[PDB]
């Protein structure tokens, strides 16, 4: 997968030479940022359910028709609510995967490459999930550069 | 690739005789129902995504292990690939319905597909179930009497459903 | 074979997409013209024998030497007359095939691709069959656009 | 531009031959459908302002936050309302262009090829315009096959 | 390459306004005469050889040095080339008549043709005379009221003749 | 042009060498046959007008409709008769050219390469000229190998 | 490339008339002398080396500075090149004599040769002298009455000599 | 590829001896009949279409299922292909007759042809019958004593017929 | 092998067509010259031994050292004389082969392609055989065009 360490190793191997000081500097940057990355991952994983429920309720309050109109693509009943909670859980799970890995690799590979055909086929509007991710970004409770990192990847998620 | 007219002309040429009144009557009936056929093709193509969505919903409802961890489509890749497959099969069904003959669907799609699915490890029985649910949804949507002029489309519905069992039997 | 419907389907398939509104318009034109095409085919098939005999007699009156000169390539005896009736029957049969199919496909495939070598080898002059087809065109008893369609394909036949 | 007539002429010219009966059948289909196409264009052009205002009000009632939240990308003031009316006018204008031309050419060329970058840059959600076009489709007052044609191109518009 | 609808749509898009009732009425009249236009195109294409023959007969009748020893077509090659040229020009006229716009005839045929003819030494004036005789013969043949339903085709005849003077003026 | 002598010279020149005994043998054959070729040319040129008139009358007697039906493509009046005599004169002139040159070169170059488009355009049936050439072949008054040579090229003319 | 028959046929076709009795008589005389022409061609080709040797001997006898130190052929290369040139010119003369027309000799050999020789610095006048000596030797050898049937070859000798002055005048 | 002279020269060279008076006499007889051979070749090539027509007429007369629905040539394609085959075989027979040796016909035509016909499913026996009828028609046409000088062509007729049985036996 | 007839047949076959009048003219030239060719072959074959002995004696009288100097490459003894007679016999045999075939084919194929290495290796001077062939040419007893043909091929032999 596309991590900075694997990319450095592949660059070093393609030229058949030992590791240079530049690659060790890059791995040093990765190691120093991994502390904030892991703090953000741990926080987002511990408060997962609260964030899921808050995001679902934010979606319902922002787009009220989703709770009123009949039809299978809506959350008018319990089945729709559970599917939506599962979806937001998938989103949060893959963003935490990407935070753990330290790059956009997991987001590029497990979510974004297939999201468009899925959303067109089942008539799911991307703005619902955009609003959910905006809520999660505004209510994750992180502070400082760890929060900055989380917001970086959340904005990566926003550009669906 | 043959349509009905081409098939009749070839079968009459290989025997060397003029067209009998039976074949003329059959082709004249095809011509008379051409407008109903165009209605069916237009409605099936312009509502393709809803048909696929309904079929997938039913299939995942009755076989939920498909969308559970460890299942055969528990990811964006496999989900999108299944939906692509379903849209492909519906597209070729629309081809056969417009042509009034199954030759394109059999020769270009149903040849070697069964081998492909068991070589890939995709369970063909669930594919056949999804195809049958596509048949049900498509026939339900085609017969919708709203927004159109009242009339009999039973022959076309039977023919389209026949195409559907031909598709489902080619992978079951 | 080369029909408008098969051509539209092949055009749609080569680009891997659903059928467009243009192809449905073309198939609509085909379906609307197929009524006149089938009327002309039915008429030409029902009055086949009368047309055959009239065309044979027109050929005999127009080129009298064909009834007088001895030689196998002529219609001086019963065998020649029967062969000529069979030939005109082949012509009418393939023109009705083409009217049924709605295109020049059958005429291009079953008759024209081999007519030239046949006529040179057996010393059959094309003007005989030209005159026969002209008679058939002037005496098919069709009226309106169905007659127009028949005449279209008859003129296609004339350009041997 | 991509019209059926221009496509037929280009197909006939690329092979250096006269026009075939298939192309005349296709042009016949185009001419017969152009009556309904022009009726739909005339109707949508005459009732343009009523449709624009109704679509704007439908957007406001369906997504109420667009009238409440401050920010330049919203319609909280008169400038936003006027910009939105202008946008819906652009949409209706280009759909009528496409109805006049008889194909997706104008929609492919003047709107869809650049809509995505425009909407991402100015933070305009496509579902607003989707709802506007749905309203226009449900309230154009057309009946029969002319309405069917209008709805065909409106659904082409929906798949933004 | 433009037809009437495409030209109107482009001219309305460059100004940014809806179609006025004038343009709508004009295009609706084009639609109403579409069947007459198809009749003209079909009759002109399926009788092309007779038109060319009549035009050539007139041209060689009034300018006989063309077909006399030392003339500019006194051979199978030059005769066949002149007939090919004439059939080409008639074919592009049929294109423009079906399209209802002269853009294809002007852009793909009438551009640089005058330079070609004077570079080849072919006298362009006699070409223009032959084109005018084609116009006369084609209009005579199109207006033939036999075998067809009675009706007014005067607008189409004027338009086709306008195409013909555009062709004749591009080489004169 | 394509004569045996020019072909031999070109073969000898392409290999940059003197003339071989084979080429001199071929030129010897050409010189020995040129006596009969020139005798046939002289005879056909002297009796040109008699042959022209006899061929025209043979055409009229064999295809009587050509003298009866009105229409520009027929010989119902003096203009048609004169055009037909001119045509048969062209045919005889080019066959004598070919007899003089000793090969099919003149027939390939001045007549056959353009005859087909000419005959299709002006609705001239090839069998008329076939019958004229058959008459000329049966009535040229030549005897022996000179007649054989003339008939060789006349049969070359027949395969129009 | 033309021979006599082809030239006569082209000139008669460009005017559109049958061959006059004059041209027929001339070509019949060509046919009658064809055997003498073949004798001339065979004797000139099979004795080519002796002709070249005699011509070179005369040329070096009257212009000895050619074969003296500092001359324009004082080496195996330039000697062999001069002999190759001489054999080439004789070969093309044999071509023209067999064809009965100078078109091949003029078009394929005598075009641009004069420019070649003055660009190379080879003195063209001595080349013309050698060509004239070739003419003398060839005519002497052709008229040899031994080993052959008695007859008149004066016309052919005049024609071959005419070819020779055409060759000599193209480089002088 | 060998002719008679080349075959005799090769067979004499492989043994290293001068030509015996027998071979000289045989080749002198070949030379003496060369004019009859040229007559046969010219008449067979310039009447090829009539020979093919007669052969095909006889073959379809005695085996009418060939030209009846379901037969092996009931179409323009198969008819034209059969006629092409027949013209090819006659052309190679004319080659062998002009060469005076069957080597070209055996090596370039009769090698692998039998395998081709049974691989294609064409009944070889009827091909052999058509070849025999070609032999009969060709011999009838060659011996026609009209328009020619009286003389004996029996040896050539025997040789040509021998070529024909070689052709017929290569596919039977 | 390279004969005029085989060359004509190969030219006709390479273009997949029947034989043309030019090839029949060439074969006619071949047939007319074959009479003189066969007369010359018969004469040279009948008087073979006389010619061989006369040529050997001419060689001995012209180059006397060949009868005087010792050494294996000379004809000082009976073995040398017999070898020389065999050699001249080979020469005459192959020239008669070429006269029979009607072309330079046999001379190009059986003698000239290998004569040079043979003569260099065994120190045989070509002028001996040149003088032998000159004697044979001056003493073959042929008259007219048959003699001319023989001399043509003898001169071909001279250019060793
Ligand atoms: C919730 C925010 C809104 C919404 C939810 C909803 N979804 C469905 C069905 C599906 N959701 C997905 C999404 C994914 N599956 C994956 O594996 C991944 C990658 C991590 C994603 C992003 C998919 C594929 C489906 C269809 C298949 C399935 O059911 O699993 C429904 C039901 C709609 C229907 O049955 O037609 C709903 C309601 N809808 C809302 O209204 C919420 C606002
Ligand atoms: C969805 C209903 C089922 C299923 C689908 C699935 N398919 C793959 C991969 C492939 N599907 C096809 C089918 C076609 N390709 C064509 O071109 C055509 C005709 C035009 C057809 C019918 C093919 C060839 C493949 C392999 C190559 C490819 O993927 O493009 C997968 C992925 C399997 C994996 O990742 O291991 C899936 C999941 N899965 C289900 O659960 C449904 C039963
Ligand atoms: C059958 C599934 C349903 C049905 C069919 C039906 N339609 C008519 C009306 C028409 N529909 C068309 C279709 C087209 N015209 C075009 O130009 C195009 C491509 C752009 C299409 C797809 C046509 C030509 C007609 C007839 C004219 C009209 O407007 O009515 C009928 C009645 C007329 C007829 O059958 O010919 C019917 C029966 N009606 C049902 O009840 C079925 C559910
Ligand atoms: C009748 C109009 C004139 C004519 C007829 C005639 N034909 C023959 C023989 C043949 N006719 C054909 C034509 C076709 N066969 C096909 O399959 C097709 C494609 C549909 C065509 C166009 C052929 C192939 C033959 C030869 C083989 C056969 O007999 O079937 C004859 C007999 C001539 C002879 O035996 O040599 C005749 C008389 N001749 C006239 O005079 C009529 C005016
Ligand atoms: C109205 C439905 C909603 C909306 C409107 C809105 N738009 C802007 C600005 C722009 N709208 C467009 C769209 C187009 N211009 C074109 O030429 C075409 C092709 C036909 C299209 C589709 C563009 C390009 C802009 C930006 C440039 C411009 O102003 O013209 C605003 C102002 C936003 C801002 O200033 O940042 C608004 C409000 N917003 C809503 O809330 C309505 C629901
Ligand atoms: C006949 C009415 C007149 C005339 C014709 C003539 N033309 C040539 C040669 C040429 N004609 C054309 C014209 C076109 N080529 C194209 O592709 C198109 C548009 C698709 C056009 C309009 C051209 C390009 C040529 C030159 C190349 C060619 O020949 O194909 C000749 C032959 C001239 C000669 O042999 O010297 C003639 C005679 N001659 C007349 O007398 C009429 C006035
Ligand atoms: C104008 C030059 C002359 C003329 C025209 C005319 N025709 C009608 C009849 C019709 N002709 C058509 C043409 C076609 N239908 C097809 O499918 C095709 C392609 C295969 C063609 C070319 C049509 C559709 C009609 C209408 C239906 C019918 O059969 O009548 C009319 C009267 C109807 C009308 O104008 O729409 C007219 C005027 N009549 C003249 O007098 C002019 C000389
Ligand atoms: C006479 C046997 C039959 C026939 C003659 C006829 N011809 C015309 C017109 C033309 N004839 C030719 C033929 C050639 N011109 C050439 O340069 C060459 C190459 C040597 C040939 C073969 C051509 C080109 C024409 C048209 C141009 C011209 O007039 O010169 C007519 C008049 C037809 C008309 O005006 O439409 C006629 C009558 N017709 C018969 O009925 C005779 C049996
Ligand atoms: C000898 C009679 C005179 C002369 C000859 C000479 N020539 C060169 C070089 C050349 N000669 C030619 C002539 C031809 N080449 C062709 O292909 C043809 C027609 C088929 C001809 C007539 C050419 C082209 C050259 C230059 C290229 C080449 O050498 O092949 C030389 C050599 C000059 C030098 O070495 O500086 C000579 C000497 N010299 C005399 O003294 C005679 C008057
Ligand atoms: C003119 C330069 C001298 C001359 C010529 C002459 N020859 C004859 C004899 C003949 N020479 C030939 C030539 C060939 N026959 C072939 O097959 C070949 C190629 C292998 C050649 C080159 C021929 C055919 C003849 C005629 C038959 C014969 O053997 O005699 C004559 C008299 C016959 C005639 O002229 O036709 C003449 C005049 N005689 C001279 O005095 C000139 C010096
Ligand atoms: C006609 C007398 C019989 C027969 C003929 C027939 N042939 C085919 C196809 C082929 N014929 C050949 C023969 C040759 N090709 C060569 O190049 C040569 C030598 C130069 C020969 C002898 C071949 C190779 C084929 C196959 C490839 C091709 O067609 O060109 C058919 C068509 C079979 C079909 O369509 O299924 C026929 C009918 N049929 C008869 O009834 C006669 C007995
Ligand atoms: C045998 C099948 C029949 C036959 C042959 C025959 N012909 C002659 C006459 C001659 N035919 C030729 C042929 C040609 N000369 C050429 O230039 C060409 C190619 C253009 C050909 C094909 C020749 C040279 C002659 C001899 C001269 C003459 O004109 O007579 C004869 C008698 C002379 C002879 O045999 O040499 C014969 C026997 N006669 C029959 O009865 C057979 C049926
Ligand atoms: C005789 C004219 C002079 C000469 C003869 C001589 N030859 C040898 C040996 C050889 N002669 C040949 C020539 C050929 N063999 C072939 O197959 C062919 C192709 C037709 C040719 C031209 C060869 C190959 C040899 C060597 C092998 C062999 O002996 O066969 C000798 C003996 C020399 C020696 O033994 O070293 C002689 C004497 N020598 C004279 O003095 C005569 C004037």
Residue numbers in the entry:
A (entry chain K), C (entry chain G), D (entry chain E), F (entry chain M), I (entry chain O): 1 to 160
B (entry chain H), E (entry chain F), G (entry chain N), H (entry chain P): 1 to 172
Give me lines lifted from the publication on this model.
C-phycocyanin (CPC), a blue pigment protein, is an indispensable component of giant phycobilisomes, which are light-harvesting antenna complexes in cyanobacteria that transfer energy efficiently to photosystems I and II. X-ray crystallographic analyses and EM analyses of CPCs have revealed that the quaternary structure of CPC is a closed toroidal (αβ)6 hexamer with D3 symmetry that is thought to be formed by assembling two trimers face-to-face. In the present study, the native CPC from O-77, namely TlCPC, was isolated and its oligomeric states were determined using X-ray crystallographic and cryo-EM analyses. These structural analyses unexpectedly revealed the coexistence of conventional hexameric (αβ)6 (TlCPC-6) and novel octameric (αβ)8 (TlCPC-8) states, even though TlCPC-6 and TlCPC-8 possessed the same amino acid sequences; notably, PBPs with C4 or D4 symmetries have not previously been reported.
To avoid the effect of crystallization, the presence of hexameric (αβ)6 and octameric (αβ)8 states was further investigated via cryo-EM analysis. Cryo-EM micrographs and selected reference-free 2D class averages clearly showed two types of ring-shaped oligomeric assemblies in frozen-hydrated specimens as expected. Accordingly, each assembly could be subjected to single particle analysis, which resulted in reconstructions of hexameric (αβ)6 and octameric (αβ)8 states with overall resolutions of 3.06 and 3.71 Å, respectively. The EM reconstruction models were essentially isostructural to the crystal models (TlCPC-6: rmsd value of 1.14 Å over 1,923 Cα atoms; TlCPC-8: rmsd value of 1.39 Å over 2,565 Cα atoms), supporting the coexistence of conventional hexameric (αβ)6 and novel octameric (αβ)8 states in the frozen solution. The local resolution maps of TlCPC-6 and TlCPC-8 showed relatively low resolutions at helices Cα, Dα, Aβ, Bβ, Cβ, Dβ, Fβ, and Gβ and in the loops D/Eα, D/Eβ, F/Gβ, and H/Iβ. Therefore, the structural fluctuations of these regions are relatively large regardless of the effects of crystal packings (X-ray) and damages induced by freezing processes (cryo-EM). The crystal and cryo-EM models of TlCPC-6 and TlCPC-8 clearly showed slight structural differences of monomer–monomer interfaces (helices Gα, Cβ, and Eβ and loop D/Eβ) and α–β subunit interfaces (helices Aα, Bα, Eα, Fα, Aβ, Bβ, Cβ, and Eβ) between TlCPC-6 and TlCPC-8; The superimposition of TlCPC-6 and TlCPC-8 monomers showed that slight structural differences existed at helices Aα, Bα, Aβ, Bβ, Cβ, and Dβ and loops A/Bα, D/Eα, A/Bβ, and D/Eβ. Therefore, extended cyclic structures were possible because the flexible interfaces acted as “hinges”, which enabled to control of the curvatures of protein rings although TlCPC-6 and TlCPC-8 possessed the same amino acid sequences.
